Symmetry: D2
Subunit: 497 residues, 4 copies
């Protein structure tokens, strides 16, 4: 059958004509019989001296680690990134230093709300995280299949996520939670419109785009800086699943995305993406009609054309999912010299969040895990110990900086870019920033009559289950975007009710 | 709508005019604005001094804990156990001390192989664990919806579960794994047959029975003991779901069981099970045709009649699923005086696995979690400290035993019952015990022509995706149970191929 | 004997009449014999059935939790804080609202470098953390027995602590590490001088002062803010131990401080401190001869007189040390309305560090631990789940903000004080800020001749073990503080060598 | 000076020619300035953008792991084991296959009661754990500097340890707890006599002996078995410290043992031990005057002569203490083919506790830690996943046993030795086995008058602080050993009181 199915068969064949290895305990002690336990008499009790049993059972009892708080359901692959164009004028990052340069990458695709045993083919954003193992350390471009997001302030994220998951008492999905939050926070209108459009359910991972979403900052050798947006378009072309097909598949194969990806790579059909960037000078950001750092807004291509950079290619499957995919950790704060963060509140928050959640999910020394190790760089610092320290722990090197004993030294050229900001240090309300303009353009221009029909149907089909006062609020927001938008949805709601 | 859907609504209503509480941090400090972060200027960077943000974010980052290694997907409810008959001549356990006595209980139903985000209506045995909060500590009767199991030795459990879960490399369900194991371990025939019958997909948790499965031991007031089986028949009657219906619902409502149960209880339709026990004297155990402790065998009702004991009633929904259901922990080892283990190898292994995995999943002091607390009993011992020690840690009471300072004392009446055992201390092979006899009785008499047909197309439907050599090995086992069994399955496989 | 020694006797006596409790397992099951394990025959192997054994052993195996990264060895006590003067013109904090108002407090004293099994009477600063359980949440004033510190930038803290602890290879205290860091980092000159003076080794915890050290911000009801310093003078008078005595006691009774404190409280000698604050207006913060936020500087009493506020009284010993002292956690970030942080880089780093380390050392829900619970406030928010969720997890309350269902609301009045900061966002070097002026005043104006002699003797006695080149740089720094300071030390160094 | 002190200087010198390494974050990103944090202006608050700070600070915050519940304070070293004599007639273990065969070993010496920052030179037994990295996996001989122990049943261990540690309320050493336990459990007399003798405080780890203590079982190539005791005498000779000197050193240098070992190895003075065994046939096991599996009994050399086997040599110091020593784990259950446990109840309990405590202290995958990995063996089994899985996690190999795909197979020649038993599975009382005979031989025949005098002074010196009723009971037991033993002690107690 397919490569995925033949996993064990192929493993067996690669062993060809050779006796199996000796079965041992965790401590390497050979096992004489791992099929029966030690008892006193054929029908007597179990003995504690049956260490083979305890050793195995105890490990079995510890196999699970907390799933990701979000994006728990996913798939992974490996490959490389190749520079096809010269953008050193914008960024001095080693990853882009010269055309033709190849850097190893690790990627993980995923949904968002569903837990580990949920279906792939469901409406939801799609995680598209890329780990670049550069000479200047790891660069994690933790993106999604959408250029924007539901909210513009990180302090609402925990709440947004809660509204998207299970009811605290019933443990069931709750449309009142979903829509009460969205209707109360109309800034989500942009991404909500994108979510309920055709692209809400990509036909697998290979048929969707990737985006850094946030506005990032690039710094060149001269210490000059510009802002940018990262884009990685699918070379396999955009392709989506119909509501009917997605539902059928969620039932027939909940792991459609995993299977698809594995089999494609296994058969030589390596998926690739064309990497681009949008650039905006500091002067332009000052004149941009919206907040250039507002995650609910996009940079119009007409005004900010896509500048080609390279290719993203996935040509290697994982050998052990848990070890290579479940344990992989992407930190947006993982940016090498030449790439920095912008003042986007959402990104700013993610700077803290990811490393934090990883220390809990994987452990303090989660960077020691092979797949997370920045193996194309030499990690040298004054960090020591911590649980599960699986390396030399930097031997006997002086553990304090500064020191007169030859220990690692800071590298001045790697110093960050400095800007002067003005205004008081407080909480600035962004609830009232433009929440409808770009959405209108999306509804009218980016979509056609046919697409606007499905959009409204998808939305009404879910919103119909929220209480009436919530439907009204939601529709009020939609109407604000465009009369036809709100009225079409209400018309459908009317029939459901 | 249904009560489940109206969870938030009712909660709101249950707070009439009552003013909303003040939103505070974890440390209880009031929050002035939890809707915007602190930045330097309207479009400046995030500040560390915004502890409101990190306080909330850090917790969000740590919401997840490892799901159960098995039976991860489930539902929970509470109620009580009431004694209707007098079995004090068999067991002195306080929970049975007198007719009419009620003991608070906690229950959790679940599937087995699927992770946290999987569907309820899938072919899989069903967990049915009952926790009795007695005065002699908690009594955990961790049962299933079947009186038997797939294997008879605990050292094969980890391997079995592995074969039921995802392929190590692809992270996909693997039929070669499932059938290679079962075909290699024919003792599984009995429970496999039950699994692939109509009983494999119950119509929710209320329409299935519960069993302790294992043979346990009861001790009366005179010190005499007998072996027993626990049974709890559904008073709502046995009802199953068809393969089509189950498949449909798995997509329409992956949380069918949680919903059904919550709603039944929320509408006053409290589900109940009649509690029975089977009794086998030590003498009868000598003559029983098979190993009375072999978990793949049942005690024929004809020879061992069900003795009514009481009722299990579920009249209360959990208020917070995570705290009351996700965190609940059942240990088969939790048995009060009057109820003891039997030499069943599988039960013996479970005496270790449960609290062991619990110390990992929940933590060292998992018994401190409210839902796991033996609240109807006074916990007094010499155990101290441990992570997250939420209690007075037993104050300044002497922490060693024995002691001359009045600390807790062991009670002679709590001494366990002794059984004489003799023979060699070694691993006795049980792979060759009877694997077909009882199975044949089920295929031939418990099932009719119509059911046998479904059983075979259910098996063949899954087995067909396994390699031919595995198919043949499987059919041979079935042929040994009954020529018709094997030949009917082979016939369906042939057309599938 | 002393009350501490008679702990068990008094406990035994408090139960005079009373029959001893039943010894149970963790789940509350009575134990018949907890003095003998279950074996097959008198000289047979141990059986897994012995859950009594396993249950207890498993908990003993998990008694230990990581000690504090710094300040590991300590002592705790409880009492109250009583307002004696009116400072509402400076702060609106409820803890200060009315003269005579009492607020329960928890306190923990400690050394810094030594691990849990180290001696109390050693040269090292002393921790003096105070937890105020207020109606506006807990307020943690995590101070030391000194008004200043060794460094003025938090990013150097880990290295500093490293240099103060064990050598990474030898696990031995390393004077080369100690002095290389200090000589390379002359900001330490001020605190080093305090450290090696007579107050380096207080005669117990009751004879030392307490300081908030950092500059903090106070806000009154009108929104006006001022900077401040917190001081808590010992009412028992300052009393130190001679180098000779401290050494003898470190051997005779490593737990001198714990014992002293316990007996003092046990015998009615309740220690108290007089609470004061120094105030500096934003206007005065401009003219100050030094950086008012530099932790290596103090505010001269002449220019900023101590203003009396209240009393700190300790009148209750811990009932269980582990539960109330080892598990206690103080977070400088725990500040209620009316009390805020200043731009002191050091304080700013601690804002993150404490809660971070607590989630590791204790666990994600450490605030659930009784002693850490802000029990005089109603914790109401949108944070849920996490390991060891010991409270009702806020039941079924809507878990997302904002919401239309009545869940907790933010109270605007608690908003923080906003200030306009000017300058570029970058790393500003502060290594060269005045490192001697105040140090010289201390040497010349605060101490007398015999005190200067001891200071030098103490410094030289420890410095003499560092390499000559380190001794030179160290002496060069002291000489810059005052020519007679450096020469005196050099003279002593000369003979020890 | 000494090698230990010159640790850093030597490290620097080794790096003679070489630019220092580039200072990086955990992710391997070069750091431009790790001496100043990012703030808004020279006197502004800290920014979240400073991931350099958070990265380092967060790891510092997690440096600590739980100390060993017992034997927390210790020292480690490495070397080898060389077989000098042929004992293959008794055991088939590969570690003994031929004369001259060397196996790498890892050793850790330690005290027992004291925590991490406690002193080395104090009365307490000494841990002498030896890890042998054999081809048949790791063999852990977790010994002590004594052939016997305080108790004979593992269920009293938690309590014993509790009495030896700190009072639960005061957190102080409690002689009432110490002696109440010992006086109530007279079986401790034998080891208490050893502990309070001159060997109670050995001069460093090199001048003490080591013993496996328990009775173990050896099996040869043709399944014949005999019982044995492991002995390893110091080739540096027995050397102890006087009470006065031990007290002084505990103040002058708490890390005395650590320093002694390091410098000794650093200067080429490699400490060695001569390894022997005592052999008792199954028939002699019947004739032995006492229970040969009683931990409080020794095998008289006259009847069971020491049989030379090999040498233990420590020639390598740790490079990183935390990594090689603090994280090292010894499990008595780690026994390769040829060496097995005996029915010694204490040993049977240790079979469980150790792997168990390690899963808590280090982590589920603690065997993956370099110093714990059985590197001279091919670990092949069916164990997968778990926190911090730092290897290939065995790749895509079939994860279930049995299978038809060439995965690891059990090896029939590695089956344990089977013995016949007969008796009730119950708790047999051993509290009344002989508790004085061998102790008398020690007091009378082994010690001379000086030593008995010192022994009594040592006991009384500590015992005098317990309550008289405890003193009397303790003396009664000593009197049961010998009239002179009790009278001499009583005479001293009279004086102290
Ligand atoms: C920027 C530098 C600092 C950092 C990063 C820092 C970090 C820490 C950490 C991580 C702990 C252990 C906390 C626990 O596990 O409970 C600790 C404890 C402590 N620190 Fe700091 N600290 C710093 C500066 C100071 C200063 C300047 C003071 C006093 C004003 C101070 C006083 C204390 C005290 C008293 C404790 C012990 C609390 C207890 O008894 O539980 N620290 N510190
Ligand atoms: C992130 N989701
Ligand atoms: C159990 N499963
Ligand atoms: C804090 N030290
Ligand atoms: C063992 N200690």
């Amino acid at each position: 059958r397919d490569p995925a199915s033949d996993q064990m068969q192929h493993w067996k064949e690669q062993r060809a004509a050779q006796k199996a290895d000796v079965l041992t305990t965790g401590a390497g002690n050979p096992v004489g019989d791992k099929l029966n336990v030690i008892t006193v008499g054929p029908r007597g009790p179990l003995l504690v001296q049956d260490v083979v049993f305890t050793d195995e059972m105890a490990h079995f009892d510890r196999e699970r680690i907390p799933e990701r708080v979000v994006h728990a359901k996913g798939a992974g692959a490996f490959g490389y990134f190749e520079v096809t164009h010269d953008i050193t004028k914008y960024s001095k990052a080693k990853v882009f230093e010269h055309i033709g340069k190849k850097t190893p990458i690790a990627v993980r695709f995923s949904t968002v709300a569903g837990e580990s045993g949920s279906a792939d083919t469901v409406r939801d954003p799609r995680g598209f995280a890329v780990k670049f193992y550069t000479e200047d350390g790891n660069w994690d471009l933790v993106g999604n299949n959408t250029p924007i997001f539901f909210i513009r302030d990180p302090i609402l994220f925990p709440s947004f996520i809660h509204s998207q998951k299970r009811n605290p008492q019933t443990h069931l999905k709750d449309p009142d939670m979903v829509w009460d939050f969205w209707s109360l926070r109309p800034e989500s209108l942009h991404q909500v419109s994108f979510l309920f459009s055709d692209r809400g359910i990509p036909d697998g991972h290979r048929h969707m785009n990737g985006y850094g979403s946030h506005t990032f900052k690039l710094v060149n050798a001269n210490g000059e800086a510009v802002y940018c947006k990262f884009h990685y378009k699918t070379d396999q072309g955009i392709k989506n699943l119909s509501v009917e097909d997605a539902a059928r598949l969620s039932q027939e194969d909940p792991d459609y995305g995993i299977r698809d990806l594995f089999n494609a790579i296994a058969t030589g059909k390596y998926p690739s993406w064309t990497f681009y960037i949008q650039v905006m000078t500091f002067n332009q950001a000052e004149t941009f009609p919206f907040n250039p750092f507002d995650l609910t807004k996009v940079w119009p291509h007409k005004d900010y054309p896509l500048i080609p950079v390279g290719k993203l290619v996935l040509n290697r499957n994982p050998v052990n999912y848990f070890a290579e995919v479940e344990q992989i950790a992407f930190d947006p704060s993982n940016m090498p010299p030449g790439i920095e963060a912008s003042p986007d509140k959402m990104l700013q928050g993610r700077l803290f969040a990811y490393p934090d959640t990883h220390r809990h999910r994987l452990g303090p020394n989660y960077l020691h895990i092979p797949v997370n190790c920045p193996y194309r760089a030499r990690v040298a610092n004054y960090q020591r110990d911590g649980p599960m320290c699986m390396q030399d722990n930097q031997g006997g090197a002086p553990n304090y900086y500064p020191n007169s004993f030859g220990a690692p030294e800071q590298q001045p050229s790697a110093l960050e870019h400095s800007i002067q900001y003005s205004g008081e240090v407080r909480r600035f309300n962004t609830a009232n920033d433009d929440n409808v303009t770009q959405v209108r353009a999306f509804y009218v221009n980016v979509l056609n009559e046919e697409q606007r029909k499905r959009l409204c149907e998808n939305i009404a089909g879910h919103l119909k289950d929220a209480q009436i006062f919530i439907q009204k609020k939601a529709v009020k927001n939609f109407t604000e975007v465009h009369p036809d938008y709100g009225s079409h949805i209400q018309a459908l709601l009317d029939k459901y009710n």
